[PDB]
């Protein structure tokens, strides 16, 4: 429910967070199951608005 | 100019003031764009709200 309230403008902030967490491999495997569940839930909920955006930089981060 | 936005979901456990429901709307003009607003009356999914401003983002009202 907490992630559901989030406006989209913070989701881009949230995705930018996971990107930065990926560099630090220690954190990634320490909290891998949690990062996965939140990440995939953010994408499913507001999928429609995510794809519509044409920002290339967002595309690389998802890459 | 006033925009029309259809609610797609009525957020729950938002801790809003009694009688104010926090909802997520998508604009009819641009179906992709979404914004979170506060509604005063009885609201359900798929009904249309008349937004005077499309810039403000809803905040929890205590």
């Amino acid at each position: 429910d907490a992630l559901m309230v989030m406006p989209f403008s913070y989701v881009l902030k949230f995705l930018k967070f996971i990107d930065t967490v990926m560099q630090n491999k220690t954190l990634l495997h320490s909290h891998l199951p949690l990062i996965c569940k939140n990440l995939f839930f953010i994408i499913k909920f507001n999928h429609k608005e995510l794809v519509s955006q044409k920002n290339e930089e967002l595309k690389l981060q998802i890459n | 100019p006033v925009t029309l936005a259809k609610v797609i979901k009525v957020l729950g456990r938002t801790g809003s003031r009694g009688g104010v429901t926090q909802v997520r709307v998508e604009f009819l003009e641009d179906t992709s764009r979404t914004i979170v607003r506060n509604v005063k009356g009885p609201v359900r999914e798929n009904d249309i709200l008349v937004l005077m401003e499309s810039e403000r983002e809803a905040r929890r009202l205590r």
Partner: peptide, 11 residues
Amino acid sequence: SLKAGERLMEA
């Protein structure tokens, strides 16, 4: 005080 979701935004 702040609720879940709202704390995450400030974070």
